[PDB]
């Protein structure tokens, strides 16, 4: 049944709750972003109001064929009324179109639902600065101190410098980047920019990108693989067998592959700096795992929460085991005692 952490008290609202059938007493279904674990259940057959960003609403219409009359896009950073309740959508610094939602309850309670987010000090100057938030529904993906990772900017610098050096040393090398969802577009776009290439991809993935309101996108991507030396493939194909296979398909235009897998966290983070990352190599194929995250590190999460000073935290991630739930609750209490709220 729908878990309590997807329901907003004092309203008829749910968040990211599309896979439970008709949720009893739900008048409006919010969707924070277009990732499958969150939209699971939506289709052209859905006939309740979906509230979301503009970009999310483009993907719902074009990719899932949801009917236009049930898509209610809202502008960001704008006080809006939904079924008699004031709400605001804020940028979540996750994937394109991802939002956090502020709910102003009739009784005076203020609730923030982060959806999925990568906390940033820039959030401390949004409309969140303007009033007190009583309850926080928190993306706790990486809520443990072992989870460190570099800035997105440091990771993109490493990727651009590695790609540029490789292709300048061997003008017959092909670059390949993995993907399985929207998000992390900077990785393949930054690499294509330094190389003076468009990124080549499947018609399905091209259609997905054309929904994202990214400026000048027609100048950066293409479905003509032959004209491109940065290719995007399913993340599943980013292995020596899949890459050898792909190389055959390019008809001797290329004699080497340099591939990137933009992972979340992986344990070499606990030891190794970005400067010191090395690839796995077999013959003329090299694969780099790069820690490009669109979720908060432990320290980023901690800073946001100690800034906001909520009265109550409701985790939305890692809630399935008692050991995770108890570990998370211990961190929340530490943060509260350290900061004095
Ligand atoms: Ni997500």
| Domain coordinates in residue numbering, the chain | 1-147+296-341, 148-295
Question: Half-sphere exposure (CA, 13 Å, Cβ side) for 131?
Answer: 13
Q: How far is the CA of 94 from the centre of ligand 1 (A)?
A: 7
This entry's atomic model was obtained through X-ray
Q: Which fold has domain 148-295?
A: Rossmann fold (3.40.50)
**Range 196-204 contact pairs with CB under 8 angstroms and sequence separation of 24 or more:** 197/228, 197/229, 197/230, 198/222, 198/224, 198/227, 198/228, 198/230, 199/228, 199/230, 199/231, 199/232, 200/224, 200/225, 200/227, 200/228, 200/230, 200/231, 200/232, 201/225, 201/231, 201/232, 202/232
Residue carrying the six token digits 């990785």: 187
User: Bridge-partner residues for 276, per DSSP?
Assistant: none
Q: What resolution in angstrom units was achieved for this structure?
A: 1.4
The whole-angstrom separation of Cα 94 and Cα 81 is 25
Provide CB contacts within 8 A for 271, sequence distance 6+: none
Tokens of 155: 């990771």
User: CA 288 → CA 20, 146, 183, 276, 293, distances in Å?
Assistant: 39, 22, 18, 12, 15
Half-sphere exposure of 259 (CA within 13 A, CB side): 28
For residue 93, report the distance from its CA to the centre of ligand 1, in Å: 11
What is the whole-number distance in angstroms between the Cα of residue 36 and the centre of ligand 1? 8
Task: List CB contacts of 241: < 8 A, sequence separation 6 or more.
Answer: none
Residue in 44, 49, 60, 5 with CA at minimum distance from that of residue 26: 49
Ligand 1 mean position, distance from CA 293 (Å): 11
- Alpha-carbon distance of 299 to 89, in angstroms, equals 24
- Superfamily of 1-147+296-341 according to CATH: Ribonuclease Z/Hydroxyacylglutathione hydrolase-like (3.60.15.10)
CA distances (Å), 103 to each of 21, 47, 58, 93, 231, in order? 24, 23, 24, 19, 42
């Amino acid at each position: 049944t729908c878990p309590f952490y997807k329901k907003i008290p004092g309203t008829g609202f749910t968040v990211d709750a599309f896979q439970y059938g008709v949720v009893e007493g739900c008048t409006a279904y919010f969707l924070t972003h277009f990732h499958s674990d969150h939209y699971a259940g939506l289709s052209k057959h859905f006939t309740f109001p979906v509230y979301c960003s503009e970009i999310t609403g483009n993907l719902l219409k074009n990719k899932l064929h949801v009917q236009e009359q049930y898509i209610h896009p809202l502008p960001l950073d704008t006080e809006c009324i939904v079924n008699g309740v004031k709400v605001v959508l804020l940028d979540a610094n996750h994937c394109p179109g991802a939002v956090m939602i502020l709910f102003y309850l009739p009784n005076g309670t203020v609730i923030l639902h982060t959806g999925d987010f990568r906390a940033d000090p820039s959030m401390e100057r949004s409309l969140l600065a303007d009033q007190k938030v009583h309850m926080l529904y928190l993306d706790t993906t990486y809520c443990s101190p072992e989870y460190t990772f570099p800035s997105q900017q440091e990771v993109i610098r490493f990727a651009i410098n590695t790609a540029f050096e490789a292709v300048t040393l061997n003008p017959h090398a092909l670059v390949v980047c993995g993907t399985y969802s929207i998000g992390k577009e900077k990785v393949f776009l930054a690499i294509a920019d330094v190389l003076g290439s468009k990124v080549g991809m499947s018609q399905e993935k091209y259609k997905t990108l054309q929904c994202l309101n990214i400026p000048e996108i027609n100048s950066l991507i293409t479905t003509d693989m032959c004209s491109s030396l940065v290719h995007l493939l399913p993340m599943m194909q980013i292995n020596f067998k899949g890459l050898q296979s792909h190389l055959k398909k390019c008809g001797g235009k290329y004699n080497q592959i340099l591939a990137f897998r933009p992972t979340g966290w992986t344990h070499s983070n606990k030891f190794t700096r970005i400067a010191d990352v090395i690839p796995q190599t077999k013959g003329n194929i090299s694969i780099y795992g790069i820690p490009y995250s669109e979720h908060s590190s432990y320290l980023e999460m901690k800073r946001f929460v100690q800034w906001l000073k909520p009265q109550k935290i409701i985790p939305t991630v890692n809630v399935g085991t008692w050991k995770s739930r108890s570990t998370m609750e211990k961190y929340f209490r530490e943060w509260k005692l350290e900061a004095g709220y």
